[PDB]
Amino acid sequence: DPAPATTFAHLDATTVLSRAIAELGIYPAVDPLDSTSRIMDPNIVGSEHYDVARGVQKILQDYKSLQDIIAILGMDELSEEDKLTVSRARKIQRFLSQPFQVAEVFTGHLGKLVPLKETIKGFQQILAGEYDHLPEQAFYMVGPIEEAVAKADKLAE
Amino acid sequence: ATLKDITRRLKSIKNIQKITKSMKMVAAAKYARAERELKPARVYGVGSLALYEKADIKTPELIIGVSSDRGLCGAIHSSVAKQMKSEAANLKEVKIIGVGDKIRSILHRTHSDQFLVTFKEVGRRPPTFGDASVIALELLNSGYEFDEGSIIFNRFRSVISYKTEEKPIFSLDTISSAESMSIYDDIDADVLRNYQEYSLANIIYYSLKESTTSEQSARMTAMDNASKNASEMIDKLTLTFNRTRQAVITKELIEIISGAAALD
Amino acid sequence: QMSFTFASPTQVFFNSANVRQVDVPTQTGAFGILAAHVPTLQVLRPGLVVVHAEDGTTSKYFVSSGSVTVNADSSVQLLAEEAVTLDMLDLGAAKANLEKAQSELLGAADEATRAEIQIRIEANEALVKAL
Amino acid sequence: YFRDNGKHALIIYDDLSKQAVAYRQMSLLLRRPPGREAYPGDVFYLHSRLLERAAKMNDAFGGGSLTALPVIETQAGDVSAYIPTNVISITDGQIFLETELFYKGIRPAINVGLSVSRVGSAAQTRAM
Amino acid sequence: VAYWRQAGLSYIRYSQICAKAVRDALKTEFKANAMKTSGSTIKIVKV
Amino acid sequence: AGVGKTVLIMELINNVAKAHGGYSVFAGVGERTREGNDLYHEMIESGVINLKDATSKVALVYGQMNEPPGARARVALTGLTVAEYFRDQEGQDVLLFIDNIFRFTQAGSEVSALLGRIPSAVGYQPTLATDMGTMQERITTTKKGSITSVQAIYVPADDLT
């Protein structure tokens, strides 16, 4: 649509919220694959952030790729590292779900603010596979990754 | 993408779908057959083991596993692949036997050496007892002599289910010649071997047939799944289609007229 | 009594059926194990299997091979590699086979080959039993 | 004429697609509203009367006929297209021709399934 | 016997010759049916 | 199509309009004169039209493709108008066999364009709703009869969204 189409030029950061993500109830409901800032770059934001993000961006992306097959066609016609990424992407997915403190009316949850490190680290860890044996709901509606672990434990009963 | 693309997809996807059913029912038919055969077989392999485990069987102080040729019949094969790969360390000459041509690169690539034999035509035309004997006979007449031994196959449980089963293979005729087993014998080292033998074929057959049957159903399933999957998916697309389709149409009339016969 | 389990891979005829006895041309011998009977394994010859079914009926069979498996218990299991009911077997052939067989043996140089013939000879003969 | 003279005539309209184009063009140039797919509406009507003029006359009309063999050239199989849809709704069937077979050799190469005779069949041959 | 068994020969082989001789045996179409059993195609992979 | 369509229809006429002392109207909008011709003979044949009754049981009102739009466009309304007499006045449960609102719809729009009107979306007459509204609303059961309406529906593109 031309309007949004135009808009981008005038932007510096776009938050495109994904109807799908939203639809997954995930709140953050983002279309993270177009919630962006041009000002993403190791140069600017330090590479760690950047890279991790790129690893993520990627991870989702690859994952994205599969989806079309899997959609009718499930797994095992895929390798399990693909599964790993998928899962990770999924954990991550859930991890982006980060509750809403404001809208306890909507959520009941209290929402989180994640100071950056828990984020950078957070993903580095999941990526590190450090989370890759936890229940995915652990990341679901959490902010700081530790809490996801905490949440994991209890979700692990 | 555009209706084209979408259709390209759609088109092919049905084709697939159709195909997917084609593979499916053929397999299901095979399945039907597979069931039948399972009757004498059922007995038969079950029998072997009810000698072996009329009594029980033991080890001294080899494995064999079997599966199909193709995938897309679930990960049926992967299971045996898995479960024999798990084994081997302990052993006690080592051999593995993977009959299977799925077990062939899901397992003939590790034990591609420590395999004793592998058989092909592992399904993909209907295998029979004859084959079990075939595969049996020379196997004996081998130089890897049997140390340990388990037979891993997909034991069918119902079409819906198999559990990759395992048995012990104690072809090693000193299992037979020994223990209480010799006390359940009550007659010499001929028939000992020649049952150990005979029963090995029975089980081989059986196990195999269970496997293949499992496979047969698993392929059905795999082929099943898909043709359903396709169906839903079509359903979404076909809209997306339309929508863009009219969207277009309409919209062009706009540009054509009043959009460009606005005054044009 | 005996639960007689009669099968070939291919055909299961009686399955732990209350048969009185089966007299079995095991390579082992022809013995008529009735009912239960100690653990014993006997390997099935080719012969005819006579299934004294606990009822005065005896079903006839040719057994070719396999093993019968003699539990301790009542259930005795002929698992004949080949077991066929005599019904489907063929004299024209039996003789015919035998002739041939006998022809072959003679050139079937080496114990194994001769054997193969001999087995066969034996076989045809064992058909010839019933034929 | 023939139709009315008992004579059985065959007109093959070969092909109307190009005509339609022309016609549309004609409308538009006439300013005169066109319509669908930029084509005028009564390009249907146009043909409808025409094609209604292809008909099987009774005996009063000598039993004649004017059989109309329209041609439509599928433009990439497109028929969804307004006029074909028109025509489709008009016809007494359409005889779908398919390439693949042609390429197969298979000449006739038709897709019979897609071929249709809505009516044709009160006019065959027991033998057949 | 042993002219085969002590020709070694798999017991399977024996058996299979027997059975094969049965397959060899049988009447008419019955004998057709022989071949069923002698699915034995089983490709000879061998490592 | 002609899957004893007509036959069935004829049979339906039989089943109700006979049985229940109904009435029928057939409005042939944009059909083939030939098929209607055929239909005639069918109708004769069926005896729902009798050549012996110019008051048989079915009025065929035809505004075949060969007409200019307006005629085809009106032929349903026309018929409707008859049926309303028949409904109210003749008190009847009219069966109004309508062939074929789609072609009607189509016809309506044809003029919409050519009338220089803007036929609304997808090309279709902006008044599509109101024309319908009034039409569909012309149809009903009153305190008098019913015009029970049987509408042939050509399904554009097997699509109907």
Curated annotation (Swiss-Prot), chain A:
GO cellular component terms given for this protein: mitochondrial inner membrane; mitochondrion; proton-transporting ATP synthase complex
Modified residues (N6-acetyllysine): 58, 112, 117, 154
Record key words, sorted: Acetylation, ATP synthesis, ATP-binding, CF(1), Glycoprotein, Hydrogen ion transport, Ion transport, Magnesium, Membrane, Metal-binding, Mitochondrion, Mitochondrion inner membrane, Nucleotide-binding, Phosphoprotein, Transit peptide, Translocase, Transport
Domain of life: Eukaryota
One function term, GO molecular function aspect: ATP hydrolysis activity
Subcellular location: Mitochondrion inner membrane
Subunit structure: Homotrimer. Component of the ATP synthase complex composed at least of ATP5F1A/subunit alpha, ATP5F1B/subunit beta, ATP5MC1/subunit c (homooctomer), MT-ATP6/subunit a, MT-ATP8/subunit 8, ATP5ME/subunit e, ATP5MF/subunit f, ATP5MG/subunit g, ATP5MK/subunit k, ATP5MJ/subunit j, ATP5F1C/subunit gamma, ATP5F1D/subunit delta, ATP5F1E/subunit epsilon, ATP5PF/subunit F6, ATP5PB/subunit b, ATP5PD/subunit d, ATP5PO/subunit OSCP.
Residues annotated with Phosphoserine modification: 47, 65
Signal peptide range in chain numbering: none
Family from the record: Belongs to the ATPase alpha/beta chains family.
Protein name: ATP synthase F(1) complex catalytic subunit beta, mitochondrial
Modified-residue entries (N6-succinyllysine), positions: 154
GO biological process: proton motive force-driven ATP synthesis; proton motive force-driven mitochondrial ATP synthesis
Gene symbol of the encoding locus: ATP5F1B
Residues of the full protein shown: 369 to 525 of 528
Keyword Heme carried by entry: no
Swiss-Prot record, chain B:
Name used for this protein in its record: ATP synthase F(1) complex subunit gamma, mitochondrial
Alphabetical UniProt keywords: Acetylation, ATP synthesis, CF(1), Hydrogen ion transport, Ion transport, Membrane, Mitochondrion, Mitochondrion inner membrane, Phosphoprotein, Transit peptide, Transport
PTM sites of type N6-succinyllysine: 24, 85, 120, 236
Binding partners and assembly: Component of the ATP synthase complex composed at least of ATP5F1A/subunit alpha, ATP5F1B/subunit beta, ATP5MC1/subunit c (homooctomer), MT-ATP6/subunit a, MT-ATP8/subunit 8, ATP5ME/subunit e, ATP5MF/subunit f, ATP5MG/subunit g, ATP5MK/subunit k, ATP5MJ/subunit j, ATP5F1C/subunit gamma, ATP5F1D/subunit delta, ATP5F1E/subunit epsilon, ATP5PF/subunit F6, ATP5PB/subunit b, ATP5PD/subunit d, ATP5PO/subunit OSCP.
Residues bearing PTM N6-acetyllysine: 14, 30, 85, 120, 163
Main location: mitochondrion
Function: Subunit gamma, of the mitochondrial membrane ATP synthase complex (F(1)F(0) ATP synthase or Complex V) that produces ATP from ADP in the presence of a proton gradient across the membrane which is generated by electron transport complexes of the respiratory chain. ATP synthase complex consist of a soluble F(1) head domain - the catalytic core - and a membrane F(1) domain - the membrane proton channel. These two domains are linked by a central stalk rotating inside the F(1) region and a stationary peripheral stalk.
Residues modified to Phosphoserine: 112
A GO CC term assigned to this protein in UniProt: mitochondrial inner membrane
Encoding gene (name): ATP5F1C
From Swiss-Prot, chain C:
GO cellular component term, pick one: mitochondrial envelope
Keyword Ribosomal protein recorded: no
GO biological process: aerobic respiration; mitochondrial proton-transporting ATP synthase complex assembly; proton motive force-driven ATP synthesis; proton motive force-driven mitochondrial ATP synthesis; proton transmembrane transport
Residues where N6-succinyllysine is found: 100, 129
Modified residues (N6-acetyllysine): 100, 129
Annotated signal sequence range: none
Subcellular location field: Mitochondrion; Mitochondrion inner membrane
Keywords: Acetylation, ATP synthesis, CF(1), Hydrogen ion transport, Ion transport, Membrane, Mitochondrion, Mitochondrion inner membrane, Transit peptide, Transport
Molecular function as annotated in GO: proton transmembrane transporter activity; proton-transporting ATP synthase activity, rotational mechanism; structural molecule activity
Origin: domain of life: Eukaryota
Function, in words: Subunit delta, of the mitochondrial membrane ATP synthase complex (F(1)F(0) ATP synthase or Complex V) that produces ATP from ADP in the presence of a proton gradient across the membrane which is generated by electron transport complexes of the respiratory chain. ATP synthase complex consist of a soluble F(1) head domain - the catalytic core - and a membrane F(1) domain - the membrane proton channel. These two domains are linked by a central stalk rotating inside the F(1) region and a stationary peripheral stalk.
Entry similarity comment: Belongs to the ATPase epsilon chain family.
Name of this protein: ATP synthase F(1) complex subunit delta, mitochondrial
Species for this entry: Bos taurus
Range covered out of full length: 37 to 167 of 168
From Swiss-Prot, chain D:
Organs and tissues of expression: Heart muscle (at protein level). Heart and liver.
Subcellular compartments: Mitochondrion inner membrane; Cell membrane
Modified residues (N6-acetyllysine): 7
Residues with PTM N6-succinyllysine: 7
Top-level taxon of the source organism: Eukaryota
Binding-site residues for Mg(2+), renumbered to this chain: 14
PTM annotation: Acetylated on lysine residues. BLOC1S1 is required for acetylation.
Transmembrane regions listed in the UniProt entry: none
Site annotation Required for activity: residues: 115
Subunit structure as annotated in this protein's UniProt entry: Homotrimer. Component of the ATP synthase complex composed at least of ATP5F1A/subunit alpha, ATP5F1B/subunit beta, ATP5MC1/subunit c (homooctomer), MT-ATP6/subunit a, MT-ATP8/subunit 8, ATP5ME/subunit e, ATP5MF/subunit f, ATP5MG/subunit g, ATP5MK/subunit k, ATP5MJ/subunit j, ATP5F1C/subunit gamma, ATP5F1D/subunit delta, ATP5F1E/subunit epsilon, ATP5PF/subunit F6, ATP5PB/subunit b, ATP5PD/subunit d, ATP5PO/subunit OSCP.
Family from the record: Belongs to the ATPase alpha/beta chains family.
Known role: Subunit alpha, of the mitochondrial membrane ATP synthase complex (F(1)F(0) ATP synthase or Complex V) that produces ATP from ADP in the presence of a proton gradient across the membrane which is generated by electron transport complexes of the respiratory chain. ATP synthase complex consist of a soluble F(1) head domain - the catalytic core - and a membrane F(1) domain - the membrane proton channel. These two domains are linked by a central stalk rotating inside the F(1) region and a stationary peripheral stalk.
Name of the protein described by the UniProt record: ATP synthase F(1) complex subunit alpha, mitochondrial
Residues of the full protein shown: 299 to 426 of 553
